[PDB]
Write a protein that binds this ligand. Structure first.
Ligand code: GDP
Ligand code: BEF
Ligand code: MG
Length: 166
């Protein structure tokens, strides 16, 4: 039984917690309660391998971000989340990637770019924009909805598959 240590990062309110909770707990969190640092663990079979997913759900609100860097350091792969209706959250991905490089002291860190809230029609980040960013980092881009489940399992299992490529 292999353990994979996943860390979910991104601006406040983009849906890190909703994504994680939909994956692990099979419901949609409608309310917004800012996270400090939460962990989830679940045993799951991914591509025929029994493994233990340890998912760190981090703070995106600066006021709740104390020690986020030390929590992030442990991670093996990162889900870099923005919301497709929040242009600034997408623009913030660059500094999240730079923070990841710093906490890992590496420029070769498993990552997946996730554009969340794809059930909403107030899109201000077009797919191709995000595809291009991901391409520049050598990683996949996946759209998700924590509300409908679209892409949710795919996004997390893709990050496990990126860790396996490292
Ligand atoms: N419609 C919709 N709302 C979402 C989605 N993901 C998150 N939200 C909402 O966005 C808000 C912030 O989500 P949350 O997961 O707490 O954000 P976090 O700060 O990134 O952890 C909450 O009101 C969620 O219900 C999504 O895929 N679709
Ligand atoms: F949990 Be979120 F980043 F407010
Ligand atoms: Mg949260």
């Amino acid at each position: 039984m292999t353990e994979y240590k996943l860390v979910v990062v991104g601006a406040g309110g983009v849906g890190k917690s909703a994504l994680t909770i939909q994956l692990i707990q099979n419901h949609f969190v409608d309310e917004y309660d800012p996270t400090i640092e939460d962990s989830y663990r679940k045993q799951v079979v991914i591509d025929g391998e029994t493994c233990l997913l340890d998912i760190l759900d981090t703070a995106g609100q600066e006021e709740y971000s104390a020690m986020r860097d030390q929590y992030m350091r442990t991670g093996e792969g990162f889900l870099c989340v923005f919301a497709i209706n929040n242009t600034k959250s997408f623009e913030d991905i660059h500094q999240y990637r730079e923070q990841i490089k710093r906490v890992k002291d590496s420029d070769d860190v498993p990552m997946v770019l996730v554009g969340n809230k794809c059930d909403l029609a107030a899109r201000t980040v077009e797919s191709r924009q995000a595809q291009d960013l991901a391409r520049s980092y050598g990683i996949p881009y996946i759209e998700t909805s924590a509300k409908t489940r679209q892409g949710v399992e795919d996004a997390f299992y893709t990050l496990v598959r990126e860790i396996r490529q490292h």
